[PDB]
């Protein structure tokens, strides 16, 4: 079915680096991303979770970025959705996402351990994580 993901990444694309971040007690959040041409997104989010958070990152991502995108997550929960390739899911964020990717061209979707020096990853980390953490 309809769609795919590439299976490297797009030479010369604008690649987002995407994270959230959510404080479990209060439940405030942010989502965002910082991109390689210097882009940037900060989204504060309400009544939200990690998983939320990540999800709603990616979804900005394809949002604002043209019909051929390379992202940048850290989030396997996530990663395990998109790969699976859901026709429909029970989650509006779910279908929203996939709404998107169907309307892209090309996407890459690479994940990235957490926290363990990947420039970009770091970058947008910093970003979400202030005043949550
Ligand atoms: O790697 C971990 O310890 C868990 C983890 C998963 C994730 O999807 O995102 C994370 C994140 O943005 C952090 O700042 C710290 C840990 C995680
Ligand atoms: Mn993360
Ligand atoms: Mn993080």
Excluded: C, M
């Excluded at 979770?49 to 979804?59: G, H």
């Excluded at 395990?80 to 996939?98: F, H, M, T």
Aim: net charge neutral; aromatic share 6%; glycine share 8%.
């Amino acid at each position: 079915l309809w769609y795919q993901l590439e299976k490297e990444p797009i030479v010369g694309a604008e690649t987002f680096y995407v994270d959230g971040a959510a404080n479990r007690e209060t439940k405030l959040g942010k989502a965002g991303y910082v991109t390689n041409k210097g882009r940037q997104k900060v989204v504060p989010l309400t009544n939200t979770t990690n998983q939320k958070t990540e999800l709603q990152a990616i979804y900005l991502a394809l949002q604002d970025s043209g019909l051929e995108v390379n992202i940048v997550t850290d989030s396997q929960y996530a990663l395990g959705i998109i790969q699976a390739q859901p026709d429909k899911s029970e989650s509006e964020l779910v279908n929203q996402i996939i709404e998107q990717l169907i309307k892209k061209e090309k996407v890459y979707l690479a994940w990235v351990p957490a926290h363990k020096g990947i420039g970009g990853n770091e970058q947008v980390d910093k970003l979400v994580s202030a005043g949550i953490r």
